[PDB]
A paper describes a structure:
Leishmania, a widespread and important protozoan pathogen of humans and animals, requires cysteine for protein biosynthesis and as a precursor of trypanothione, a glutathione–spermidine conjugate unique to trypanosomatids with an essential role in redox metabolism and antioxidant defence. Firstly, serine acetyltransferase (SAT) generates O-acetylserine (OAS) to supply the substrate for the second stage, which is catalyzed by the pyridoxal phosphate (PLP)-dependent [name] (CS; EC 2.5.1.47). This de novo pathway for cysteine biosynthesis is found in plants, bacteria and some protozoa, but is absent from mammals.
The structure of LmCS was determined to a resolution of 1.8 Å. The LmCS subunit contains two domains. In addition, residues 307–333 at the C-terminus form an extended helix–loop–helix structure that stretches across the surface of the partner subunit. However, the crystals were colourless and there was no electron density to indicate that PLP was present. A fragment of the crystallization agent PGA-LM is bound in an ordered fashion to the same region of both subunits of the LmCS dimer. The interactions between carboxyls from PGA and the side chain and main chain of Thr83 and the main-chain amides of Asn82, Ser274 and Phe273 are common to both binding sites. The binding of PGA may have contributed to the absence of PLP and the unresolved loop between residues 214 and 241 in LmCS. In LmCS, the placement of these two residues ensures that the active site is considerably widened with respect to that found in orthologues of known structure.
Author numbering:
A (entry chain B): 4 to 214, 241 to 333
B (entry chain A): 3 to 213, 241 to 333
Write the structure that this text describes.
């Protein structure tokens, strides 16, 4: 349990997790409390930092990654790939990312900042092209290891070990409902398991955006436009600046917070990622378009 | 009994400002000194200026100089100071107007506008001076408008004397031999130096300059090319992702770390801003130009 107030970290690893929790304030006009678990405050700005750490930590203990021998091969360019590149670099591993050429230049650049080898695959073959290429690499080099196997193996576990228990402690053992995205790669499974291990009867709600069954009490559907509108209202009302998945979660949480049986209760949801990564994407396009056509004051007004 | 954000739920994103982590430089430090990085990049809006933003609103309100829902906050800033004022202003219900030259990036316009700030553009030729002139015109024309710079002057050093400096003191276990930060303005330098000397520290105070004066023991000049190179080395060695200022500070720290008299000693410096804000600027153009020319694997190698 690393205490940031009284210590200097040996490694940026130690700054992963132990993220803040924040009550929704202006945007919450309901009779329920809504707690945001702020995973956007991780060192590389998303929840997936916990997964990147888990992969290196747990696979090394298993002897399946060997620092400075293993080449880590990851067929994904989103936050899991960012965290693997980030933490691979400081542990001494070469990291290869395979990604379609059609993924954004900005995604390429962030991965390369950490010294990953970025290998581009044909747009017309999509995500499958990148998976084929990763497999080609591992077949050719017996030192190379596919990361996605470990992402699958450890993801729910790290959230049952860390994220879930943090929420339990931060809310002082008071969670009536926990809400997160159904996507997997996320916190849903592990947080749900942690809560159920603590005794908690909390309602578990999976959020499914639109264009383990035992663990999930309800799937709540959220329209894309509502997730996007919510992300922008959240920043203006409460100063929380996040991506699409956080907007969808907050939209869902605010609806569920108005249910009669949720009055006086505590609802917890996740803010997975900081918003700045998405400024150039469709999420904030409306704002980009607005600022693109602003007028300019004439110099004749400014030279008195 | 001061709020513990790792163990309790915050009422406001304000409470998550400051109390940032501190991190030892390792792979990049091949000296016999210890270099501690104060990780201001970990603030809620990804820079040290969150502390100044908060100090401005909190202290101006307590002195009746800003009145929520009445005062219009006006700032001439193409930097993080404007970003923080816009971010925290929105939460508190203030209208915020930011003036900046038309030559600043769309990304920067977009960030401010995400908070709901009014963005006013001034001629490229007149630079920041023209943005300053316009801010003063706006304030002249609205009796509810106030110029934020006056507050930044009054409160900048004080907030770092009260918060950043005492944090550094506790985090290093009362053990600081040298403190290094940028002259700029908005820097931590004056306030931290005052805190350190108040708490009995004999730390040497070093002002970093590109190529209160009585608290400074040494000016250290850093060429821009060394600042830029150092920013990119930092990501790949230690996973620290920052801007130009942090690059320059770390370069200076590493050179001071080589002095015989610093053997065994503790040097503290500041990482002011997270690097993501700068990914599409000149600082990381070397990486961008590289990933924009990568070859694409031929479909024939992967089509199944
Ligand atoms: Cl998100
Ligand atoms: Cl910086």
């Amino acid at each position: 349990p690393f205490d940031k107030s009284r210590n200097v970290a040996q490694s940026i690893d130690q700054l992963i997790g132990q993220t803040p929790a924040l009550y929704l304030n202006k945007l919450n006009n309901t009779k329920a409390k809504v707690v945001l678990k702020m995973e956007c405050e991780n060192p590389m700005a998303s929840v997936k930092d916990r997964l990147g750490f888990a992969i290196y930590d747990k696979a090394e203990k298993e002897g399946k990654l060997i620092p400075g021998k293993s080449v880590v091969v990851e067929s994904s360019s989103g936050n899991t790939g960012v965290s693997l590149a980030h933490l691979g670099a400081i542990r001494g591993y070469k990291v290869i990312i395979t990604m379609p050429e059609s993924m954004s230049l900005e995604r390429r650049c962030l991965l390369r900042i950490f010294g990953a080898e970025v290998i581009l695959t044909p747009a017309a073959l999509g995500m499958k092209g990148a998976v084929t290429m990763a497999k080609k690499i591992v077949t050719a080099n017996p030192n190379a290891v596919l990361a996605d196997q470990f992402a699958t193996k450890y993801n729910a576990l790290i959230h049952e070990e860390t994220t879930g228990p943090e929420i339990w402690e931060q809310t002082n053992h008071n969670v009536d409902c926990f809400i997160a995205g159904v996507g997997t790669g996320g916190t849903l499974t592990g947080v749900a398991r942690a809560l159920k291990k603590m005794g908690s009867h909390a309602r578990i709600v999976a959020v499914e955006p639109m264009e383990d069954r035992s663990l999930i009490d309800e799937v709540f559907c959220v329209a894309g436009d509502d997730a996007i509108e919510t992300a922008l209202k959240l920043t203006r009302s409460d100063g929380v600046f996040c991506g699409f998945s956080g907007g969808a979660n907050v939209y869902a949480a605010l609806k569920i917070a108005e249910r009669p049986e949720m009055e006086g209760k505590t609802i917890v949801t996740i803010i997975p990622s900081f918003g700045e990564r998405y400024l150039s994407t469709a999420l904030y396009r409306s704002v980009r378009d607005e600022v693109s056509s602003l007028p300019v004051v004439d110099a004749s007004e400014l030279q008195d």
